[PDB]
Symmetry: C2
Subunit: 263 residues, 2 copies
Amino acid sequence: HHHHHHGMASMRILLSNDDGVHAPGIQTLAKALREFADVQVVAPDRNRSGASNSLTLESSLRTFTFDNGDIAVQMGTPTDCVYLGVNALMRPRPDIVVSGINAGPNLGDDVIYSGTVAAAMAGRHLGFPALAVSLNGYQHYDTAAAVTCALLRGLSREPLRTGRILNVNVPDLPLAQVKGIRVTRCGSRHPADKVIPQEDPRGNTLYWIGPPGDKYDAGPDTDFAAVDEGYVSVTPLHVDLTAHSAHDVVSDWLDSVGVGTQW
Amino acid sequence: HHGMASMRILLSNDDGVHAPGIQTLAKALREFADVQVVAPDRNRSGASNSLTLESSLRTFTFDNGDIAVQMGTPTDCVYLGVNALMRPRPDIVVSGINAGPNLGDDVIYSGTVAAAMAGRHLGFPALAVSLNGYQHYDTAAAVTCALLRGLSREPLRTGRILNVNVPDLPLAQVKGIRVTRCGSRHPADKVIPQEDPRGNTLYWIGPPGDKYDAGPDTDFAAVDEGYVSVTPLHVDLTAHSAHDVVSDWLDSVGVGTQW
Ligand SMILES: Nc1ncnc2c1ncn2[C@@H]1O[C@H](CO)[C@@H](O)[C@H]1O
Ligand SMILES: Nc1ncnc2[nH]cnc12
Ligand SMILES: [Mg+2]
Ligand SMILES: [Mg+2]
């Protein structure tokens, strides 16, 4: 009939985040996805920014269902949410996990700390590649929602053959000002070094973790560079932490220092 | 003592400050190095690279000088150790000895690995050390000490984190070391539901998926064959091999192009 999307409920999406179920990023995105997808939100009960791929192992998890059908996992991490949503809670099972929209970027080596990214990585085995979506700010959730809907419509047109996780960072701009899209690699930062002390009412010093370090590798092929230049950044991710290129150096080093070998 | 300089180690873990793995290791390391423990106050296995951002962190210092971070994650402990609690900054982070392995694609969830990753910008590559069981902490301590002597004999030029898994055997039975890559598992899919006394269903995370990639060059295979597995890790999660396929895909579906 000619509509922007084919089907009002053609894809089953598990939508999660790490800002928590009440966050404007996930709620704005849910409203956009519900136009064309069958969406089930399964997200943390509060802001779990910084949760990375942490899992709850020593306790069981309780869920809470809101009047609108959204599910919070109480005390749940983003990884808990996706793991339970895929493997226990959702029927039918999701075709895809979408995680976001996060309030703030997930770029460079920040990605391994990101609970937004971790929710997506917990969906890497599904029929479509998982999407992690982060806004470089707090102002244009509508832009990030539009980019996400475009990517999802793209997946309906042709399957993506390689890459199981897409880390998407959206500039905080009206859509008409976004320049385009770049496929990027993760940049990197200097080590974060700030600790912010704050005395409690009894005079004891407590410590706040400081902000990320300055950009270090923010070259033209990086996610940083794309966002900074007004492009959407798309970086395909994987979970293999092996530094493959260090293999021979490490082997030769062990031999040279006689650890593992008698001579 | 012997060299021109003492090695100054920040030692952490995620089993908790009182765990036998970290205390066994601390005793061994203090024979030759200056050791500062900064570790979670409790078992935080599965903490991955999580960071406490929502609250400030409280520390406790024990009579022996060990520092526990109350509700701190392993990454929190290393962050506070490197940036506030040790002056000057440590030479190296050593994390472990973990009670149990950290192998294959499970490494991304490991708080033992995360503490080592948090030390990746120091003067020596960080060590994460995990015992494939609970008996031979002594074996894993001896292996760690050997690596640390190794790092002071010649610099390791490439690789900022070494993930070390030690078979749970007496030292005499360990065959040697293999430099490995992380193996992988099938998708984990088991949830263990248990009702509370009111009939509400609560959910436990189940066992990992069965091994998928666990052949000859993997960390799994090394440990199974009685070798220490050493895998260099990095924090760049980019799937570089997918770049062209993703770019061509976007073009083919008209996302980011008018044509
Ligand atoms: N000290 C820090 N180290 C790393 N990431 C930080 C820090 N402070 C804030 N963040 C950001 O918060 C996000 C939560 O994971 C991280 O992705 C990271 O970019
Ligand atoms: N069930 C599980 N799934 C994924 N990672 C794990 N690490 C420990 N248990 C796990
Ligand atoms: Mg967040
Ligand atoms: Mg542990």
